Amino acid sequence: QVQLVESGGGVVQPGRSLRLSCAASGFTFSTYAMHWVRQAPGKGLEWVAVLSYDGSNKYYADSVKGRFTISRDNSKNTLYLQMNSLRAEDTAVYYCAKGGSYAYYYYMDVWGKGTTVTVSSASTKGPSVFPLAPGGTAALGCLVKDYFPEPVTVSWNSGALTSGVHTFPAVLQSSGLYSLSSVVTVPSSSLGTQTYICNVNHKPSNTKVDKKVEPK
Amino acid sequence: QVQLVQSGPEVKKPGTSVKVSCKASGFTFTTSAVQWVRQARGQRLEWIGWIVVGSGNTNYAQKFQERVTITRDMSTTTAYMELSSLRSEDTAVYFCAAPHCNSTSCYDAFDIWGQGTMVTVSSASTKGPSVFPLAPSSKSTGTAALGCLVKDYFPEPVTVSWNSGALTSGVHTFPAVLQSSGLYSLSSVVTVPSSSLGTQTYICNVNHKPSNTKVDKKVEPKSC
Amino acid sequence: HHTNLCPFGEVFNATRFASVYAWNRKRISNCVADYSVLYNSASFSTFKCYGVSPTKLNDLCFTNVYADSFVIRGDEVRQIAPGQTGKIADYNYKLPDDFTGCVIAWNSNNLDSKVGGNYNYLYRLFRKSNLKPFERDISTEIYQAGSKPCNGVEGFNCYFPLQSYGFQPTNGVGYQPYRVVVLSFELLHAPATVCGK
């Protein structure tokens, strides 16, 4: 029952600072070495930093050297990661991991669930929902464009239409806002006697948009 | 009390070996290094070699690669220099030096130096000196000169005093010379007022510890 | 996890052992250990356990067991213990004060000694500071004993940090090679995977 809980992740502006924390349970935290590992969206795993049992010896990765600082508070059984001079490439999911016995930095046993750090200067904005208007079978969908931050949820006909639905993962535009599309394939026979509505829900901005997709 | 104390004097026959010790105290020996330097009488300092205490790695001068091995024992915190196939040219004073260190850091030069070890190489045997007076002449009215000739002894050194130390002013005791016989000769002189030649007694005290010889000699004006 | 003997043979009977400066660790998990056979084995010069009684080891369970192995000489075996000082404990392999485990060592002169001397086994000679417990240092950077930089070349106050052992068959017992295995017993708030039977 070794468990590590992370927190402090969220939206942070480029060049500003953020500090993550990791709460450990199930072992004598004050004796063990501690790790931070991150994973950018669509990337592999990258080791960030490691701390000795007493916190006096620190080792970082070149990608974060001189910008990140790893620390710990043994009385509170928590591990910290001070992130300064943040860049867009620091956008990742950050995990803490239990290390070796004392100064045995070479182990990375149990990982935490992970906290998400998003580096963007964009502000919370609701999505604009545009219809993708519609062979033997036709395709139609909705364009969920220009929203921030993640995520959005798209369903069709309040959950009745689930067969053939493909809600694509979002892409990050050069504007800093996300774009997403959700399509559904239907028989062309029912195009004139069955209405299709996509239910876009964006909790961070409290937006609920129901868009009716019609032929042209 | 950061110190380096070396062995006593050595007198070896030609062709034998000598092993001079150099015990360290006051600093952490294990992270320092010891160099060895010899110096003939009146000549320059000559580097023999050095050793790193921690590793035992050594470097020797080309002149001494054939006959020198420098070692050290960390349990007795001592360094050694062993010179084999000794010959007359090896007769000199031998110094050891080292930088002082704690458990991690060391001084940036050889700042500790031992007292030195005098090594003599010759075929001669121990012999006490013969002390002959250098009688004052019948000159001036004015200062006169007298002294003692400390002749034919081995090895170095002899020590000469006058009137058991009561006479030091005007005294000159010259460094000994090595005669072709392999024995040393030394002279000690003192200048005194000519008026005191008849009423002041002058005795030179020659001591030669290697032969346990104590000679007192009275120096008087010549008796015609 | 229950029907498999712990692979202690791969540690003790390993063909090659590591230098103490680069000591090797193997994780022992999900197996059944027989510690009594090792404790009563007549092939071990040292079998000192800390924080746990070696006689009641077959009655204990642990979440994980870790086996550290390396080679030193006999008179240095006394340093593989908590609260020790010396070239090995300070610069090569350090045990914590609260160490819970067993230190096992045996004379390996017939294996780790060559005719002209075995110089493959190394140990760290200098370091800026003592090792923390269970720290491993495999750097080969020139040690700077003075205030002047070394520039990657040895010289006055600039020495290579690793030194080789002698290890010749005719050496004294205190200078002969010994193989050391340090078992440490880890106990977390998790299901115990290494028990004794």
Next chain:
Amino acid sequence: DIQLTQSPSSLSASVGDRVTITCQASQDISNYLNWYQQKPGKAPKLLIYDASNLETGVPSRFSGGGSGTDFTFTITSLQPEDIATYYCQQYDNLPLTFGGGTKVDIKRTVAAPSVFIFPPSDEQLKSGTASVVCLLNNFYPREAKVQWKVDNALQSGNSQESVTEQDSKDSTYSLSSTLTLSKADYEKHKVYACEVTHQGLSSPVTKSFNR
């Protein structure tokens, strides 16, 4: 640093197959190699530690071998819940470094993509932005190429793509490509098309529309 090279970067196998992926180290790392399984959305989970040994709970179908520089990771009888990305990780010295990863796919019959093109909606053109959408629906394998054509001109640097996960029922993928132009640039041209090249198609398929 120590560099790890995984091979292959991706592969496809059916349930019951024996999967084998390799991990080569730039220098000798003894047996200090870990093998992770990471399923989409979750954190990596350790399967093999010390190159050869099974982590607690991990099914016995996973195994690993090797010491020094060349290592292997094996799944004797691939199962439906074994579809994930697998990483090797060395821990001989800091920094801890991972391999490039190996995505394990379900093998199925080659399916050509169903290509649909969508002109921008009139509501979006009122805002001053145009987004053309090209859909590639239910195809296999995942590798697909889409090139945009605006009046016989190949487009580059003005489009973004997104791919779904493998469908748990038909084992096909779906790809969405969006061409983003300003409304001004959208009104200057007439022919918009996306050319789709795929293994299932003996020749690229082009869906176009006249503005």
Next chain:
Amino acid sequence: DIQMTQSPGTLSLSPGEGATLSCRASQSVSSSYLAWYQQKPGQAPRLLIYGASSGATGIPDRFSGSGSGTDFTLTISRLEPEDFAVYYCQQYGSSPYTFGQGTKVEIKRTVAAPSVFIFPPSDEQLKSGTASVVCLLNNFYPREAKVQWKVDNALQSGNSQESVTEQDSKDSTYSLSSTLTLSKADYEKHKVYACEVTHQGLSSPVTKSFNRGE
């Protein structure tokens, strides 16, 4: 090997003057591995300057060092009585750690002529079968002096040995002892025994003699 050369051989200065000593290396040495030592007669070398320009612990700040590459200098701003000694430089950057030949710093004094004394062999020594004639040169400056033995005006050679004292700590003078050694037979074959002394402080060579027996 790196050759170390020092200059001048001897430095004659008055107490209070400044001293400037030179140490040159046959090739570039690291300035951080050049040391200066002071050695007084009958004593061990004492470290003065290290790293070319760093004073050792306990060394008065009147000792200054400079140099880099091949040329190095030891500088004494105000020469104190305890500063008159021999000074060596040693490079210890490249093995072997070679020394210079040393530079003696002596007290420059007014020219002083030597007082010359001649001593016949004692009657006690003639019993032994050997005769020693001693010629004493007392308290002169500078150190350069010449002693010539003449037996019945016959120039002697190969049968004399000399010896000089250190510079006296009170009058800054030197003294010389020359010993003419003959057999008892050879000694009794001649009459006039004389030693001629040449020195800068003498307008012409001074001769002290004695007639055997008288």
